[PDB]
């Protein structure tokens, strides 16, 4: 019943153990909340359906059906590169997927407020994997050179040197020609997915989803405004 | 599961042995031709050791066991052929037809009749056929027959010859490492009557091989490192003629016969000394064998080479006696002055340098007992021709100052200065002898017995120290004149001056410090006969020790020479002779474990060791026989130096838990001397375990017990990096561990390892393990230092010059007649081979290769190259002749 990392009640005269102090926080829920990512869903996706179908193939399948790749005798993918202009749904899709398949959506920023939960110094980034394999069905997410070396240091671990599975990384950025060529090793990246700016139809449905919570007046013709 | 198809062997042997009771009676042909077709087929289908899962040997006796139990017993008309077909098939699977109670019923198939010439169907196969079965014969069957029924019926008579041809089948099939299974047949066969099987396999071994003598020869000395006293009695005398009858290697005779000298018969190695004086083959091995007969494991040989051929081969004896002893001098005369040895190194006291500036100031320690150790700045550094001209003024100006036992001590250092000498060691003493002093003359004439030690030529049979003894009137003229004669003539065994010193024991003079070292004087000379020495001791023991209940002047000195007079035999007769001799009160029965275990230095008889600790374990002993129990642990200190690493781990594993940890007086007061008797070898296992109880001085005891373990802890020769440990303890030892009782003791401790850079082979293991006295001269000091009252007055006779059997250092010596060769050597770690493959890799310390008189070291095995072939002695022995030959182009 004595758990490591648990508060206690303590008497003061002989320091006799008194009572178990409930629980305090997870070291990931704490910092994770401090970040406050805007959680998302499929129901707020504006017209990105084939992108959904691609990312399901990379992430959804080696969770619900890990044997399905043993059906083909091929290894499961590990990494996802997402690209396109900003403001194009990268964050909400990335949060959305781990939200639906219930993976521990853990992005990193390289901030220093986050740092105190990782460790006292965390001379590597690899100390994160302690919490990551502790939330083992997890997804690491990264923004747009330190991100570039960081991802490489991830993939060098999970190239076979990490045995814990269901830990998959997603980097979201722009301008794919200017990143690393060793990152552009063809055995390195499993899939790169482009995010185009919206056409007139995909400008209409985001007006639809986004127009839900407003108090409207009858008769609008959103198509014109989408044009 | 692929069953069926090829089931001929679970069907037709399921048929024809089942149709054998239906085909023994009323079917005369099917009884014998199907038994023959059962014999050649179970024979042929089980000779190969690749399919040990035979198709009948684990298949037919599911019914063939009940068929055999109603076929061999229940037939009752067994003829002369049907037993040669019956018992040749039924005796083969019976180790696996039967389970673990086969052992009472191997004979219900085999002893009906052994079918013919059983090796005819045991020719190809190694051990599955019957050799395992014959091991089951000799394991249990021959043990129950030949426990008290050796001379018996078929269970011994044919079993000798069947135990002959199977033993030749070990050295018949492959000549693999299964040859060492034949000592497990000859030995497990008739354990105590080993001579009757060694007669059957000794002549067979004489016709066996000249190459397969060495690894089984080693295997036998492996089997002779330790045994019960009858098998160490028997296997070692059967061990002797194998390099004589079969082999003619013949040069490892004397040093490995020292083995077979004391337990079997003292005339046995004298008949092997005759066997030395029969093989007059050659100056080289003839020289090198008798080199060791003087100062390497024994003496008492210098009266047996004066035959009618005194030219050079029987004038070898003088060259053995002193001229190769002069080569031992010549080591220090030539070979040590070239490497580093200066006339006065002197600078370990200079190495005592830095305490004046480590933590303040100095000019503080001014004890007169410091000058006792300052005599060893002279004395210890000056062994092996460390001769000094007016560098002896630290003993000259302290020779006329105070400390009468220091007038004994500085005069007694000079014999340690002139060691192994006959030439001028009488001339150097007389320049300081004439001072008309009881204390200077007796220490100097005591050093006269030290100079000629090992010489035993005409120096003092009754010339000098007899003139020292007959001056008798008080102190050390009476005392220190009997010591050097037992010292130099300790290796002698002359009865005449033993009877010059027998009225010293039969004098019954009240000079008890003389009468106690009298037994220590006479015991060093003889170890065997002359029970009248023992009578002379025990008579004065009854006259004086009975009418008192006092100090260990009696106990440390008087029964010890009895252990010297009855050292070295496991016969357990001498325990009856001396243990029932001084039947008495328990403080004269202090001598109960003396002569018992002093006879038992190195053997295997740990049934004595259980009667060496079961009697008096603790008992709380309210200051009654803590002396008898510290002596009872003092006799635990043999049996451990030479069980070839067997009981040394069984001593360091035990005594650290038993006595020094969970003892009240034996461990805290005394029991550290096992680490000063077991070794001088040196290793960090104990070597870092003793300063845990030394650097923690634990002064609440009589702290000269721990400081008694200080210099003893420092007992190790072969100098090391331990100057940190000892000099740190003298650094805290300047202020603490008071110089009032320990100024002699810390520098005595420090100077002890570096006596000289060399001259440290003092540790009783020559060749590989044979003794070389080494105990009669060493042991009475650890007997002497039990407690107190001898760091000041009485023990200053012993604390200087107790052990002086330093049979030098090195083995790298050419000793060709020209002496122009240097060497071609390669020193290594000690070997590890017991049985291995092609030309057994000996050691693995290839990193070092030399050619000169360089160091010996403790765990070293040394070989060579260049096709020199080293044909002299080939094992060890440090005076190889080093002949050479080049039949290898």
């Amino acid at each position: 019943d004595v758990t490591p990392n648990c508060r206690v009640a303590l008497r003061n005269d002989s320091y006799t153990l008194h009572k178990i102090l409930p629980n305090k926080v997870d070291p990931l829920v704490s910092l994770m909340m401090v970040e406050k990512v805007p959680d998302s869903t499929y129901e707020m996706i504006g017209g990105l359906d084939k992108q959904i179908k691609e990312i399901k193939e990379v992430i959804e399948l080696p969770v619900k059906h890990p044997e399905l790749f043993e059906a083909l005798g091929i290894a499961q993918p590990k990494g996802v590169l997402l690209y396109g202009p900003p403001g194009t749904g990268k964050t909400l899709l990335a949060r959305a997927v781990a939200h639906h398949t219930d993976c521990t959506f853990i992005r990193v920023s390289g901030s220093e407020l986050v740092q105190k939960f990782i460790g006292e110094g965390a001379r590597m980034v690899r100390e994160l994997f302690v919490m990551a394999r502790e939330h083992a069905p997890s997804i690491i997410f990264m923004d747009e050179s330190e991100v570039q070396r960081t991802m490489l240091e991830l993939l060098n671990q999970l190239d076979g040197f990490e045995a814990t599975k269901n830990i998959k990384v997603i980097m979201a950025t722009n301008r794919i020609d200017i990143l690393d060529s060793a990152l552009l090793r063809p055995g390195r990246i499993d899939r790169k997915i482009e995010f185009p700016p919206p056409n007139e139809e995909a400008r209409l449905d985001i007006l639809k989803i986004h127009s839900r919570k407003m108090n409207l007046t009858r008769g609008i013709n959103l198509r014109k405004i989408a044009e | 599961m692929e069953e069926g198809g090829r089931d001929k062997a679970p069907v037709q042997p399921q048929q024809s042995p089942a149709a054998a009771p239906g085909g023994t009676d009323e079917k005369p042909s099917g009884k014998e031709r199907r038994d023959a077709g059962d014999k050649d087929k179970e024979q042929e289908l089980s000779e190969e050791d690749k399919q040990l899962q035979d198709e009948l040997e684990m298949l037919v006796e599911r019914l063939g066991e009940k068929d055999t139990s109603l076929y061999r017993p229940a037939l009752e008309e067994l003829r002369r052929q049907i037993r040669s077909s019956t018992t040749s098939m039924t005796s083969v699977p019976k180790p696996l037809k039967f389970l673990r109670p086969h052992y009472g019923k191997l004979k219900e198939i085999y002893e009906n009749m052994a079918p013919g010439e059983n090796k005819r169907f045991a020719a190809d196969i190694i051990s599955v056929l019957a050799m395992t079965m014959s091991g089951e014969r000799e394991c249990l069957k021959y043990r129950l027959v030949g426990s008290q029924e050796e001379l018996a019926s078929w269970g011994h008579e044919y079993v000798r010859h069947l135990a002959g041809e199977v033993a030749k089948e070990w050295q018949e099939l492959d000549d693999a490492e299964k040859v060492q299974r034949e000592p497990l047949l000859t030995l497990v066969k008739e354990i105590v009557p080993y001579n009757m099987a060694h007669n059957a396999e000794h002549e067979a071994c004489d016709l066996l091989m000249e190459i397969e003598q060495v690894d089984m020869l080693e295997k036998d000395i492996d089997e002779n490192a330790y045994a019960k006293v009858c098998l160490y009695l028997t296997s070692c005398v059967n061990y002797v003629p194998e390099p004589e009858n079969s082999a003619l290697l013949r040069c490892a005779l004397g040093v490995f016969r020292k083995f077979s000298r004391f337990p079997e018969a003292l005339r046995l190695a004298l008949m092997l000394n005759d066997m030395e004086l029969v093989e007059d083959i050659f100056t080289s091995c003839k020289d090198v064998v008798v080199q060791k007969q003087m100062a390497f494991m024994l003496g008492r040989h210098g009266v047996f080479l004066e035959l009618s051929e005194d030219v050079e081969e029987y004038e070898d004896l003088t060259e053995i006696m002193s001229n190769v002893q002069l080569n031992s001098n010549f080591l220090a005369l030539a070979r040590e002055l070239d490497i580093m040895e200066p006339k006065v190194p002197d600078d370990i006291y200079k190495t005592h340098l830095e305490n004046n500036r480590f933590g303040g100031s100095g000019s503080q320690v001014d004890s007169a007992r410091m000058n006792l150790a300052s005599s060893f700045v002279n004395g210890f550094v000056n062994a092996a021709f460390g001769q000094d001209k007016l560098l002896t003024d630290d003993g000259n100006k302290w020779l006329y100052k105070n400390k009468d036992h220091g007038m004994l001590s500085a005069a007694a250092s000079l014999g340690m200065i002139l060691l192994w000498d006959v030439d001028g060691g009488l001339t150097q003493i007389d320049k300081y002898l004439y001072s008309s002093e009881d204390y200077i003359k007796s220490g100097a004439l005591l050093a006269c017995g030290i100079v000629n030690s090992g010489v035993r030529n005409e120096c003092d049979p009754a010339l000098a120290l007899l003139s020292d003894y007959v001056l008798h009137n008080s102190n050390t003229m009476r005392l220190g004149s009997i010591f050097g004669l037992g010292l130099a003539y300790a290796g002698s065994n002359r009865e005449d001056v033993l009877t010059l010193l027998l009225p010293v024991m039969g004098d019954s003079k009240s000079s008890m410090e003389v009468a106690g070292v009298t037994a220590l004087a006479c015991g060093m000379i003889a170890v065997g006969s002359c029970n009248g020495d023992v009578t002379s001791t025990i008579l004065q023991t009854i006259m004086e020790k009975s009418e008192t209940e006092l100090k260990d002047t009696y106990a440390r000195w008087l029964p010890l020479g009895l252990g010297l007079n009855h050292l070295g035999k496991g016969e357990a007769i001498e325990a009856i002779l001396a243990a029932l001799e001084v039947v008495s009160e328990p403080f004269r029965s202090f001598a109960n474990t003396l002569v018992d275990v002093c006879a038992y230095a190195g053997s295997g008889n740990v049934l004595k060791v259980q009667q060496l600790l079961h009697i008096c374990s603790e008992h709380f002993d309210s200051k009654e026989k803590e002396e008898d129990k510290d002596k009872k642990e003092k006799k635990d200190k043999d049996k451990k130096e030479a069980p070839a690493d067997m009981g040394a781990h069984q001593g360091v594993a035990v005594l650290g838990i038993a006595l020094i940890a969970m003892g009240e007086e034996i461990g805290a007061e005394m029991a550290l001397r096992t680490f000063g008797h077991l070794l001088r070898y040196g290793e960090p296992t104990l070597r870092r375990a003793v300063p845990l109880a030394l650097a923690l001085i634990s002064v609440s005891n009589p702290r000269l017990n721990i400081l008694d373990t200080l210099s003893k802890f420092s007992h190790d020769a072969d100098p090391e990096v331990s100057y940190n440990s000892i000099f740190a303890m003298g650094m805290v030892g300047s202020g603490t561990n008071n110089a009032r009782l320990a100024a002699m003791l810390r520098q005595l401790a420090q100077y002890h390892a570096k006596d000289p850079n060399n001259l440290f082979m003092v540790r009783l293991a020559q060749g590989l393990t044979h003794l070389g006295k080494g105990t009669l001269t060493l042991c009475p000091y650890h007997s002497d230092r039990q407690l107190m009252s001898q760091v000041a007055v009485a023990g200053l006779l012993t604390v200087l010059v107790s052990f002086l059997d330093v049979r030098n250092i090195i083995l790298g010596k050419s000793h060709y007649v020209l002496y122009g060769l240097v060497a071609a050597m390669q020193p290594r770690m000690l070997v590890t081979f017991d049985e291995e493959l092609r030309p057994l890799p000996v050691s693995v310390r290839v990193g070092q290769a030399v050619d000169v008189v360089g160091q010996a070291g403790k765990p070293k095995t040394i070989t060579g190259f260049q096709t020199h072939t080293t044909p002299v002695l080939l094992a060890h022995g440090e005076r190889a002749e080093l002949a050479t030959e080049e039949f290898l182009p």
Binding site: - | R100, A661, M662, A849
Partner: protein, 394 residues
């Protein structure tokens, strides 16, 4: 023969060892303590004797005294400061100022003086232990061995031949050349032969994160250095600890230079180190500061270059003395094949040339095995070879 009979008579006593050694008491594998059979000195007496009369005697630091009276000025770790007093057991002699003293928690009076602070990262770089490197093993540069050894040990082993002649021996010496030439390997024979405090220093270990941080470490190093009488201070790869001063614009490499200036001050000026000898070694000496290169700090200036022919043959006889070879090979042929070559390369050729005999099934190398080493190590690795821009030391 007695297969089970040796096995279970073996096994019941291998167990019966433990079955009564639990009844001895070695058990209850701890969390940080000692053997129960050992501690029994503090059993009934020191349990209430080294405890119940014994105080805590909290240690402090003296600020200063004042005249005519003790009236001492104490200082503690965090807390305030007092006017304090001695005990009777000590004299007011060794109660000098800036000293650590043991002080009771109640009367606040002084019990015993203490040694000052040592900063144990400096304590770690005392080696305490000697390597095995023989002067026999650095053969080929014997004049450098002599010219160094006459500086290093000869006053320490004989402080009379310099005194009675009336000269003060030098104190400082650098050792330099291309890498792998035997600089560090040469220093190991000194640390072998020596006896006093041999305190080694690698300069990159002084690279600190704070300001002045390594500079105080220098000071402390010379503090405990001045405690010892004779002491040898080793400096490896001092180009990290300083090239020179070149500052321009934004202050670049400021921090290293101040520590180097402290190293200057501890070496020369105002009643110096006395009997403290130093020994630097660099790879590229051309980067070094001239005031550092001023004599009185770096007097002896030993070069290490490649051996001519005979030193190289001697190095062959060093690394090659202890390996199974063909008897009738010659090394002078191989030294002819190695003009511009270090002894590390020679050793590497020895170790590869053994591996050729290890390749198929040979016990001793041959001459052509050595030739198989030569082209691979010398000529096939000749793209790298690391030497020539270090011959000019750039």
């Amino acid at each position: 023969t007695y297969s089970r009979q040796i096995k279970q008579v073996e096994d019941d006593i291998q167990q019966l060892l433990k079955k009564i050694n639990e009844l001895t008491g070695i058990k209850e594998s701890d969390t940080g303590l000692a053997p129960p059979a050992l501690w029994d000195l503090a059993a009934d007496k020191q349990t209430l004797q080294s405890e119940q009369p014994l105080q805590v005697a909290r240690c402090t630091k003296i600020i200063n005294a004042d005249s005519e009276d003790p009236k001492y000025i104490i200082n503690v770790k965090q807390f305030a400061k007092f006017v304090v007093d001695l005990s009777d057991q000590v004299a007011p002699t060794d109660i000098e100022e800036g000293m650590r003293v043991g002080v009771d928690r109640n009367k606040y009076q002084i019990h015993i003086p203490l040694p000052p602070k040592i900063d144990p990262t400096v304590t770690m770089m005392q080696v305490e232990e000697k390597p095995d490197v023989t002067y026999s093993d650095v053969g080929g540069c014997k004049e450098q061995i002599e010219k160094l050894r006459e500086v290093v040990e000869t006053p320490l082993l004989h402080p009379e031949r310099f005194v009675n002649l009336g000269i003060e021996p030098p104190k400082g010496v650098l050792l330099f050349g291309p890498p792998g030439t035997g600089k560090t390997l040469c220093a190991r024979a000194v640390a072998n032969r020596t006896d006093a405090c041999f305190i080694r220093v690698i300069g990159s270990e002084l690279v600190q994160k704070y300001v002045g941080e390594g500079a105080r470490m220098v000071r402390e190093l010379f503090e405990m250095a001045r405690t010892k009488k004779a002491c040898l201070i080793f400096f490896d790869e001092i180009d990290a600890i300083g090239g020179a001063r070149f500052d321009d614009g934004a202050g670049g490499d400021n921090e290293v230079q101040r520590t180097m200036l402290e190293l200057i001050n501890q070496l020369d000026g105002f009643d110096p180190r006395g009997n403290i000898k130093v020994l630097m070694a660099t790879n590229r000496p051309d980067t070094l500061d001239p005031a550092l290169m001023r004599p009185g700090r770096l007097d002896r200036k030993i070069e290490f270059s490649l051996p001519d022919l005979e030193g190289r043959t001697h190095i062959f006889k060093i690394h090659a003395r202890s390996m199974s070879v063909e008897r009738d090979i010659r090394f002078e042929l191989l030294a002819r094949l190695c003009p511009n070559s270090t002894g590390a390369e020679i050793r590497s050729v020895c170790t590869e040339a053994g591996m050729f005999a290890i390749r198929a099934r040979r016990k001793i190398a041959t001459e052509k095995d050595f030739l198989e080493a030569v082209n691979k190590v010398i000529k096939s690795y000749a793209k790298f070879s690391a030497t020539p821009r270090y011959m000019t030391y750039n």
